[PDB]
């Protein structure tokens, strides 16, 4: 034998590893790598947008510390 | 008035007009009332999304729930008609011209 | 040269996929029946070749007649093997099937299955054991690794 | 950078698919006695590669009586919403991150019975109308149990969230509270996605095979994988909405993992009671949803409607 | 002018309407139905009613579905019409189309009235609300609020749908 | 023909749905809150036929809100107006006006 | 409540899933009505801040409204806390 | 946008399937070979005759509860109101209706088949 | 300080606007530059046309539909 089942199953184990990992790893390649924002609600949304117009490089995941507040 | 709205009432308009011509079918009739019924429950919530009544949200959810009673009564009369007959034709509808 | 090579590989290709999966049509008359079932037994596992039954017509690659062909059922027979979307195979197992064996005779039984289908293997027996009629459908399968359709295409 | 998600989204799950099939016949022939399919390739490994070749490399057929319009749209509708239906799914992030991800979930669950009729009909032929009335009433008799079974459920989640299902259950499995519940999901999902006890559609010893009877070649294929892609996607949602792993912010490759370890087993199991019953008939399956299984199933909404205001257990995230 | 997207959704809302309108026997009503429902749906999600949307979806598929079982047991004929096998079912379908097109030619091109009054157009997006505000759906709560709020609408709807259970229990027992 | 029930027993039974401005859940405004809330005190008491006339500025304001029409008019009289000046080519927007501003939180 | 035994028997031995629905279906229908959280499931409900609190005028006539959220007037959820 | 996205790319992989699938082998089709299919014979009727159903009612029932999931659903979010006495009160009243439909449906022999 | 911060950045996009119209609508004989609609004199909340109606496409989508399109 039964462990000649155990290959085709561990097949199609790894084709279901692909699609999340790979999910994970695009949302932190195209948001610097810290877990893409989640904006369920309107104030959420607010927020994000006001990052991306403190940036100044248009993109929200550029984020500013203490430091820009001289 | 934007685009949308005349094309939901224009919708509307289209769909009352092929309910009022009957062709040989009633469940096409039918589908023609549902058809009313989807025109009128989508700009139901668009005028409701537009202007924020929040109170309104729950109406169109009602008023789609009577259209299922509508559907459902038309259901069960087809039913009949094709028991008495063996065809939903509105042609057979015509024992009380006299 | 280049495009006969690449004609090859793709023969060679297309006829593993077509030899590996295997897919007769769940369909016997007669006492061969029970061996072709007994084919499908734990103890032979036709399975295990890539070789499972389906009832559609439409979904299979082979046909195995197996039971004596009459008068009557020859018309359902032909009509059952043209359905049979194409590359399509025939299978004649045992004598009844195979010639009219122990029928040959009869007022009501067709001489031979290959007077109403074309027929590609022929398995003899009445019946032939489950073995044998593993052996015929792994010569089908040899049979139609051999073929050459790209190869022959291209030299048109 | 989103269309290679998509696409990394869309590949791997036909491969599964692909691979899949060759688990569920290996599975099948041990449970029967016998080996499965080990000639073609170590282990049986390339025979989804020669299905798939033999199937797209054989003629198509086009009914005479048949609508055609109908008869190629249908299963390019079946095989397009089977791979949607994987996108609101979380593992753990969610390629497409949806307030209300369980209702598109239903949404497309309702319209993917839509394309096994408008075949059945197309076809324009006796055993494939036949199926298509029997998928009708399939739905009609598992609808309504299925949409109160996930509501009840799911007040104890507080939204439709499905990302949230990873919070609700971050010290126990869901399994633990609504067992019932979990019990008829079950059921459910098995009377959904048409699998014995309850391939009544199909219907292979009565209907030959039913409303794919004058499929062939590529469009079968295309039904096919259909098929399997919707056993895995029911199979990830119950292990998502039951057996909630534990998810790592710093490392989604344990829940990932867990989250496969777990869609694995129970489409395992679902292998597993095809090969161990027999099959029903549709008016006896509705009869078993609606005499059986919504009374019970109306008095646990009922339960767990009052349980978190009595108990003082709400959910967040109005 | 902004991507025309709800103004696609909009036209491809009436074109299923006239589809489903011109009565191509009940199958490929239902079809044009499901396609303007699902179109409505997607409309209405532009604009922020998602869970009205979903339901509405959900609903008319389910509602739509029982109409394919009663359309094949009671609705059926040797030869069903398609839009383009009967010289009426065409003239009605190409009056359609071309009754949309005017319409929509005559508000594009020129500030007119047609039936209610003169319009603007010039892309649905103008008359958005700027809304920032709240950590919750508007719709959400709304939709909520009917248990709080909506006694009097919630009694009246059971009674209503019991009362309809047992009005087609009457009408189809029938003797 | 109008039997007012609620009004003699002080019911409540659909009252709180007519008007835009009657307590929505959690304190959520409507569009056109204030313009309502003017109409309606405004209007109050005096009955529809004086309320026609007398009231016909904040139901104008109203309606207004409402709709946009006004509105919608003006801003596609500038776009146009901008339009051709641009054709002609005298005008020449400012770069804040062409996604090259500085923005502000 | 004698032959009221009978027929509870008759249905567990015959209809046991009815039996089991309509339990449960009285006990969530009762339940609520003597349990004591039910209060501070309301509570609960309502001590949740959706809405910006909108500050008080000063007039020197609230003993009872505090000038800063520090201060040891207004509502306070240490229940909450312990709850 | 995104999900429009992948609904054009999931229909686009499933049309081009069929184009492959239909274009790419050979294809002989004869009037013997596409006639529609029986077991072994040609078919007496038509299958677009009428096909009787003997679960209609079951049918218009399913549509009446399917509107009742409708009113049913928003009950997680009507579960965060202050009032929770008169919320859990329609609840109840709303699912003792749709319980109470379904009893005077079974009982008057409504949920049996036609014969 | 995000209700202030919100406060002036609608008050500078009106102030933008109004100078702009200015200078576009001066040829307009009867044209009265900031006229407003309303009878009444109380402030009315901007209508996302007044304040990205002058600007490109992109943002005036990225404010109508931004938060609906991000999932
Ligand atoms: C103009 C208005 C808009 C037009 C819409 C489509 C454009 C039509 C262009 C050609 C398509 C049909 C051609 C044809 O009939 O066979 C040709 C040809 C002729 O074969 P034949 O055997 O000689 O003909 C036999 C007889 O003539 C009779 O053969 P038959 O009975 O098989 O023909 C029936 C056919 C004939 O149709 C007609 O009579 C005229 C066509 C007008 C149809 C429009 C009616 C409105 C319906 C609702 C609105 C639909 C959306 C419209 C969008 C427009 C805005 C962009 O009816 C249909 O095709 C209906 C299906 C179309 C709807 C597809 C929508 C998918 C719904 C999925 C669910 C939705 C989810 C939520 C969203 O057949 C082929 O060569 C094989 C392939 C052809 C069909 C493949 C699939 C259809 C093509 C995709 C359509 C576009 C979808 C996007
Ligand atoms: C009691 O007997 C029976 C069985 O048991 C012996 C069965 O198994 C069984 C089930 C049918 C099997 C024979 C399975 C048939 C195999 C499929 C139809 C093949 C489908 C697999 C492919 C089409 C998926 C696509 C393949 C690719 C490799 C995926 C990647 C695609 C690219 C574009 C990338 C039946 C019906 C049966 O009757
Ligand atoms: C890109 C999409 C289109 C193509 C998709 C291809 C998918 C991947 C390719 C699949 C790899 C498998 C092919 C090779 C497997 C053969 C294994 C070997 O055993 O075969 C032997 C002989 O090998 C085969 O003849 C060779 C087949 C393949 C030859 C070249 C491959 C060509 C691939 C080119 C693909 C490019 C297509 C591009 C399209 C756009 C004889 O075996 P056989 O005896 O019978 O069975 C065992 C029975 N026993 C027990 C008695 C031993
Ligand atoms: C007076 C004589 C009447 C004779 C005619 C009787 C026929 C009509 C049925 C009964 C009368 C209906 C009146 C109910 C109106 C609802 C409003 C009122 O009752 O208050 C509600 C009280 O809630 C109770 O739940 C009322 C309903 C309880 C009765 C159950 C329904 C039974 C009706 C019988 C007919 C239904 C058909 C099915 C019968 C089994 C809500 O109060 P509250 O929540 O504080 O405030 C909400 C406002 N907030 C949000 C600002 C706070
Ligand atoms: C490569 C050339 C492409 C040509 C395409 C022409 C299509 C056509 O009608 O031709 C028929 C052609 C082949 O038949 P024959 O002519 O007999 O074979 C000739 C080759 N020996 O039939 C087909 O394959 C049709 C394939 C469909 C094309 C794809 C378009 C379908 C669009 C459907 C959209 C609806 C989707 C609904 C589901 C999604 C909802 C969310
Ligand atoms: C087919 C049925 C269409 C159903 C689409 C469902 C998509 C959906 O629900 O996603 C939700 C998501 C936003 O919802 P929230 O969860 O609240 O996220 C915002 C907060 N961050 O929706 C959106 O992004 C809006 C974008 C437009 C929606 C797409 C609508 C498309 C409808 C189908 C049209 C198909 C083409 C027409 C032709 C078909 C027939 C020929
Ligand atoms: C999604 C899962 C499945 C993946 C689908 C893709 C499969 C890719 C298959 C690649 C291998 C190539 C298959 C070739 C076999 C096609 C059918 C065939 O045998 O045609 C035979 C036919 C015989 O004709 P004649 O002998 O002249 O006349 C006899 C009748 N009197 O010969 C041909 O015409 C075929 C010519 C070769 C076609 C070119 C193939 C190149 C590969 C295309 C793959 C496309 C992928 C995208
Ligand atoms: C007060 C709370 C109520 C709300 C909660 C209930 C939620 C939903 C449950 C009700 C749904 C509908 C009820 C079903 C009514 C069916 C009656 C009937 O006629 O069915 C009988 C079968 O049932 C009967 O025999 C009649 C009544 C049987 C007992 C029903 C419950 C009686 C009381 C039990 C519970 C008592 C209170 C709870 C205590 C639990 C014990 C500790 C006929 O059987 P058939 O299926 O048609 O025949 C096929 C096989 N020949
Ligand atoms: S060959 Fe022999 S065993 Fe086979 S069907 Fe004929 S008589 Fe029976």
Redesign the interface.
């Known amino acids: 034998?039964?462990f000649?089942?155990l290959?085709?199953?561990a097949?199609?184990?790894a084709?279901?590893?692909?699609?999340?990992?790979?999910?994970?790893h695009?949302?932190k390649?195209?948001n610097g790598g810290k877990?893409?924002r989640?904006?369920?609600?309107?104030?959420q949304?607010?927020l994000?947008?006001?990052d991306?117009?403190?940036s100044?490089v248009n993109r929200y995941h550029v984020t500013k510390g203490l430091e820009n507040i001289d | 008035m934007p685009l949308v709205y005349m094309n939901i009432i224009m919708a509307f308009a289209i769909a009352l007009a092929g309910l009022l011509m009957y062709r040989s079918h009633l469940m096409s009739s039918l589908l023609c009332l549902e058809g009313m019924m989807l025109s009128l429950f989508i700009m139901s919530t668009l005028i409701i999304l537009n202007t924020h009544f929040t109170l309104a949200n729950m109406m169109p959810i009602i008023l789609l729930v009577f259209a299922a009673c509508e559907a459902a009564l038309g259901l069960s009369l087809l039913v009949m008609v094709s028991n008495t007959y063996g065809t939903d034709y509105v042609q057979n509808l015509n024992l009380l011209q006299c | 040269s280049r495009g006969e090579y690449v004609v090859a590989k793709l023969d060679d290709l297309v006829n593993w996929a077509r030899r590996s999966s295997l897919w007769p049509m769940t369909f016997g008359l007669a006492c061969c029946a029970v061996e072709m079932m007994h084919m499908a037994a734990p103890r032979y596992d036709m399975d295990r070749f890539g070789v499972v039954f389906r009832a559609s017509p439409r979904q299979s690659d082979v046909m195995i007649v197996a039971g004596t062909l009459t008068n009557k059922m020859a018309p359902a027979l032909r009509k059952v093997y043209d359905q049979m979307p194409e590359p399509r195979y025939v299978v004649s197992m045992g004598s009844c099937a195979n010639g009219g064996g122990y029928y040959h005779y009869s007022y009501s039984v067709v001489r031979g299955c290959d007077r109403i289908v074309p027929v590609d293997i022929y398995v003899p027996g009445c019946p032939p054991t489950a073995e044998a009629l593993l052996y015929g459908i792994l010569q089908l399968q040899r049979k139609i690794k051999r073929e050459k359709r790209l190869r022959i295409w291209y030299r048109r | 950078?989103?269309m290679?998600?998509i696409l990394?989204?869309i590949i791997?799950?036909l491969?599964?698919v692909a691979?899949?099939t060759?688990?569920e016949r290996?599975?099948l022939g041990?449970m029967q006695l016998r080996?499965?399919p080990?000639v073609v390739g170590?282990?049986?490994?390339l025979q989804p590669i020669a299905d798939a070749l033999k199937l797209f490399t054989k003629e198509p057929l086009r009914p005479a009586t048949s609508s055609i319009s109908m008869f190629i749209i249908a299963p390019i509708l079946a095989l397009s919403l089977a791979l949607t239906m994987?996108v609101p799914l979380p593992?753990?992030?969610?390629?497409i991150?949806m307030?209300l991800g369980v209702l598109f979930m239903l949404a497309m669950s309702s319209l993917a019975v839509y394309s096994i009729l408008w075949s059945g009909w197309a076809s324009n032929s006796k055993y494939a109308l036949i199926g298509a009335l029997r998928a009708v009433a399939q739905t009609i008799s598992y609808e309504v149990t299925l949409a109160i079974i996930l509501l009840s459920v799911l007040l104890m989640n507080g939204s439709y969230?499905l990302?949230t299902l990873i919070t609700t259950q971050e010290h126990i499995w869901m399994i633990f509270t609504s067992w019932p519940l979990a019990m008829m999901w079950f059921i459910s999902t098995l009377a959904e996605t048409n699998r014995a006890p309850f391939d009544l559609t199909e219907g292979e010893s009565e209907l030959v095979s039913g409303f794919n009877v004058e499929y062939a070649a590529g469009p079968f294929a295309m039904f096919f994988m259909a098929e399997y892609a919707n056993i895995?996607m029911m199979n990830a949602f119950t292990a998502i909405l039951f057996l909630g792993a534990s998810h790592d912010?710093h490392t989604?490759?344990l829940?990932?993992?867990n989250?496969?370890?777990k869609?694995?087993a129970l489409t395992?199991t679902f292998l597993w009671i095809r090969a161990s019953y027999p099959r029903f008939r549709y008016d006896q399956l509705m009869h078993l949803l609606w005499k059986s299984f919504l009374p019970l199933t109306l008095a646990l909404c009922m339960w767990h409607i009052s349980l978190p205001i009595m108990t003082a257990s709400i959910p967040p995230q109005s | 002018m902004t991507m025309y997207i709800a103004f696609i959704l909009s036209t491809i809302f009436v074109i299923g309407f006239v589809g489903f309108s011109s009565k191509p026997s009940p199958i490929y009503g239902g079809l044009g139905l499901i396609v303007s429902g699902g179109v409505g749906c997607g409309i209405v999600l532009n604009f922020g009613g998602s869970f009205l949307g979903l339901m509405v979806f959900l609903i008319y598929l389910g509602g739509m579905l029982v109409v394919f079982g009663y359309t094949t047991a009671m609705a059926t004929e040797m030869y069903p019409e398609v839009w383009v096998s009967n010289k009426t079912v065409f003239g009605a379908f190409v009056s359609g189309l071309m009754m949309e097109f005017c319409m929509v030619y005559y508000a594009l091109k020129e500030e007119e009235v047609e039936i209610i009054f003169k319009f603007n157009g010039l892309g649905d997006w103008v008359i958005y609300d700027t809304?920032?505000?709240?950590?919750?759906?508007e719709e959400a709560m709304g939709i909520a609020a009917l248990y709080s709020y909506g006694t009097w609408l919630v009694i009246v709807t059971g009674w209503s749908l019991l009362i309809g259970v047992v009005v087609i229990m009457e009408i189809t027992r029938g003797n | 023909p109008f039997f007012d029930v609620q009004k003699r027993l002080g019911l409540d039974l659909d009252r709180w749905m007519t008007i835009q401005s009657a307590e929505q859940p959690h304190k959520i405004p409507g569009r056109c809150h204030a313009f309502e809330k003017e109409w309606i005190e405004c209007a109050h008491g005096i009955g529809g036929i004086r309320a026609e006339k007398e009231c016909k500025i904040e139901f104008d304001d109203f309606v207004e809100c409402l709709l946009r029409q006004k509105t919608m008019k003006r801003l596609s009289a500038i776009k146009r107006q901008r339009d051709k000046l641009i054709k002609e080519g005298k005008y020449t927007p400012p770069p804040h006006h062409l996604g090259k501003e500085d923005?502000?939180? | 409540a004698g032959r009221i035994a009978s027929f509870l028997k008759n249905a567990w031995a015959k209809e046991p899933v009815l039996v089991a629905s309509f339990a449960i279906g009285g006990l969530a229908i009762i339940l609520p009505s003597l349990s004591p959280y039910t209060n501070y499931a309301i509570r609960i409900n309502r001590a949740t801040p959706y809405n910006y609190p909108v500050p008080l005028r000063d007039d020197g006539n609230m003993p009872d409204v505090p000038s800063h959220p520090q201060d040891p007037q207004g509502p306070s959820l240490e229940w909450l806390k312990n709850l | 946008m995104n999900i429009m996205l992948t609904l054009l790319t999931n229909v686009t992989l499933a049309s081009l399937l069929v184009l492959i699938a239909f274009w790419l082998p050979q294809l002989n089709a004869y009037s013997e070979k596409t006639s529609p299919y029986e077991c072994g014979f040609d078919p007496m009727g038509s299958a677009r005759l009428p096909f009787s159903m003997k679960f209609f009612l079951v049918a218009i029932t399913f549509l009446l509860f399917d509107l009742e999931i409708a009113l049913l659903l928003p009950l997680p979010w009507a579960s965060q109101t202050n009032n929770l006495k008169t919320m859990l009160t329609m609840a109840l009243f709303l699912l003792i209706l749709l319980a109470a439909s379904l009893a005077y449906e079974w009982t008057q022999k409504g949920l049996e088949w036609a014969e | 300080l995000?209700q202030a911060?919100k406060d002036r950045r609608v008050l500078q996009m009106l102030r933008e606007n109004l100078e702009e119209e200015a200078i576009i609508m001066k040829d307009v004989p009867d044209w009265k530059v900031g006229e407003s609609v309303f009878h009444t004199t109380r402030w009315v909340t901007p209508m996302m046309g007044e304040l990205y109606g002058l600007r490109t496409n992109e943002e005036i989508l990225?404010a109508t539909y931004?938060?609906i399109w991000?999932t």
Do not use: Q
């Open positions: 034998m039964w000649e089942i290959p085709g199953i097949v199609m184990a084709c279901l590893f692909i699609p999340g990992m790979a999910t994970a695009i949302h390649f195209t877990e893409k989640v904006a369920h609600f309107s104030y949304w607010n994000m947008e006001r991306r117009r403190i100044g | 950078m989103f290679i998600n990394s989204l791997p799950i491969l599964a691979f899949l060759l688990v290996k599975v041990y080996k499965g080990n170590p282990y049986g490994l994987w593992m753990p992030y969610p390629l991150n307030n969230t990302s895995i912010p989604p490759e829940y990932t993992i989250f496969v370890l869609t694995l395992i | 809304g920032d505000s709240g950590f919750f759906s | 923005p502000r939180p | 995000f911060e990225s931004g938060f991000y």
